[PDB]
Structure 1
């Protein structure tokens, strides 16, 4: 009974948090404004505007109608639970439990969408850990982070495989790439991207001075390889002509040199090494395919380089979470969430920070 009341209060807080994160008053006002616009005849004068307003009204209606139905369901469940508890009706109690479970599943579906709106949140992920300023201490700290993340993945039931792991010579690991597989693994892990600051008594310094070390965790989603596309012949212009320095009656007369131009891109390849126009055309086709592939690889490498440039320097100012063991405090700078059970967090109790970050969005 009391756990059921606690569940009801948690669902009430969850619904209020959903309403406030979504600004239910703002969404309701926007929906009413869209309704007024749509009732006005001039709304359909622009078909794109009318369809946009219809889609917006459908989304706002989903959210608003779901919340309006959910509030009433919770109130009704509360009343039915009061009646069942008062009358000592076990069947009604079980029915209320089933209804509360169904409503909790509904709210959980809504809050799951809210937590993972992102397109790739459902994909598996890769986690890269790199040591930073601490040197050997940073490498040790990176190994500790790797252990923590593996333990958290095991808690969540994901499957992990070390793609690679460079080990520091004195201690720890310089770097590690880990593959995490599971349901919304990238969604759950993406908020952990950043630099992690560690403060303790350096277990390497001879004097045991209180030092600071940094380690970076970078999470990126697993990506399917690009489907190869055949070069559409309609996209190519082929020119045959005489080769330069043509020596002899035959060579002067024959059109052996081939040039292929990709109309969409403008990239041109040319071959005239062989006496046969067919061989030259085949080689030029190979070169054109290679050049298109090289262009796409160059674009992908440019995006990767942009990600590398964007990555926060693993240094003294950049930190998403601070783990001070001497003070026995762990604080997330972004969300403000603070804990004192450093041992539990290092053993893998990251759900507090991860859930807080997802809720904050």
Structure 2
């Protein structure tokens, strides 16, 4: 019980705050809200109270800054550190009131041709170095070589802890402006690469052939069989009530063989049905976050002539391009989160 006392101290306000709100009889007219308060617990009250506490403390911290001729170093440092600490604490306690599994990383060439492939190789090397200096694992699922340099198209899987929550922001277009290595003259060229980041989902399968949701019809066959065929129920038809799929078999002389093989055909025919839907959902997701590598839609730019890297989503410009290219891209992704979760403080209604 290292920090259970903080939980009890939080308990000791809603322990009687909740009473006048459970029976206030303003949030009960609609059916959903009563059980929302019952199950979703006590988010609104304690979160608003903790927001007010944060606002008061931040108001306290701002003051006491216009003073000179005194050793204002360590007390100012500790005051701003407490400001940032409470800021992060309230940030998390209000964002929470997840998705931190493994990831798939795909990069492929956009405008440029061979130069795009070379930049794809460079970009993949950057991501691999970043993963390597995190005790993560990279495994090459698929590769398509680019005759001159790197990869037309590379798919890898990155394994670790909390991988997705860091790399989900790299999906989009990346623009590179530089003098290509495949170019006789000395011309600057602008080209692009396209990146997609996917979460790793569970892939369970269920044989939904539970007899409680089947209907079997037994009847006569048709064709030439003599007198035994007329007076016998050798033809089977199975229909699946949920999915509405019907399979009929009368190929053999025996009802049992017909029922068995028609049941197998029904199983295969139903399994393909959800395989196709899963494939199409995944393809639509990829097409939506992937983009058309076209140097006009892009998330960031790398300018090698001026040694500059810029992120257009947050309008940030650093002049540390070679550190970026050496797998130290955390400085490009830490501020992004701060902007992203800067929306989460507003998203409360």
Fold shared per TM-score above 0.5: yes
Give, in angstroms, the shift of residue 38 of structure 1. 6.0
Measured in 2, the distance between the counterparts of 1:141 and 1:257 equals: 63
Give, in angstroms, the shift of residue 155 of structure 1. 2.7
Measured in 2, the distance between the counterparts of 1:142 and 1:183 equals: 25
Q: For the structure 1 residues 143 and 112, does the alpha-carbon distance in structure 2 shift closer, same or farther, using more than 3 Å as the test?
A: farther
Give, in angstroms, the shift of residue 353 of structure 1. 2.3
Give the TM-score normalised by structure 2: 0.77
Q: For the structure 1 residues 263 and 109, does the alpha-carbon distance in structure 2 shift closer, same or farther, using more than 3 Å as the test?
A: farther
Measured in 1, the distance between the counterparts of 2:89 and 2:222 equals: 70
Q: Determine if the alignment matches structure 1 residue 130 to structure 2 residue 108.
A: yes
1:316 aligned residue (295, 298, 307)? 295
Q: What's the counterpart of residue 130 of structure 2? A: 152
Measured in 2, the distance between the counterparts of 1:36 and 1:336 equals: 47
Give a deviation string over 1:100-149, Cα, whole Å, max 9, x none.
99x95x8757656778x7x5x21100100111211110000000000110
Root mean square deviation, CA, Å: 3.2
Q: Determine if the alignment matches structure 1 residue 347 to structure 2 residue 326.
A: yes
Helix, strand or coil at the partner of 2:190:
strand
Q: For the structure 1 residues 204 and 239, does the alpha-carbon distance in structure 2 shift closer, same or farther, using more than 3 Å as the test?
A: same
Helix, strand or coil at the partner of 1:258:
strand
Q: For the structure 1 residues 74 and 155, does the alpha-carbon distance in structure 2 shift closer, same or farther, using more than 3 Å as the test?
A: farther
Q: What's the counterpart of residue 360 of structure 1? A: 339
| Count of residue pairs brought into register by the alignment | 304
Bigger share in helix: 1
Give structure 1 stretches of 5+ with no counterpart: 1-33, 78-96
Q: What's the counterpart of residue 240 of structure 1? A: 218
Q: What's the counterpart of residue 149 of structure 2? A: 171
Helix, strand or coil at the partner of 2:182:
coil
Measured in 2, the distance between the counterparts of 1:58 and 1:199 equals: 52
Give, in angstroms, the shift of residue 154 of structure 1. 2.0
Helix, strand or coil at the partner of 1:147:
helix
Q: For the structure 1 residues 148 and 209, does the alpha-carbon distance in structure 2 shift closer, same or farther, using more than 3 Å as the test?
A: same
Q: What's the counterpart of residue 249 of structure 1? A: 227
Preserved contact between residue 236 and residue 248 of structure 2 (Cα < 8 Å): yes
Preserved contact between residue 193 and residue 218 of structure 1 (Cα < 8 Å): yes
Measured in 1, the distance between the counterparts of 2:90 and 2:134 equals: 20
Q: What's the counterpart of residue 25 of structure 2? A: 41
Preserved contact between residue 100 and residue 163 of structure 2 (Cα < 8 Å): yes
Give the TM-score normalised by structure 1: 0.75
Q: For the structure 1 residues 57 and 261, does the alpha-carbon distance in structure 2 shift closer, same or farther, using more than 3 Å as the test?
A: closer
Measured in 1, the distance between the counterparts of 2:262 and 2:41 equals: 55
Q: For the structure 1 residues 307 and 157, does the alpha-carbon distance in structure 2 shift closer, same or farther, using more than 3 Å as the test?
A: same
Give, in angstroms, the shift of residue 213 of structure 1. 1.4
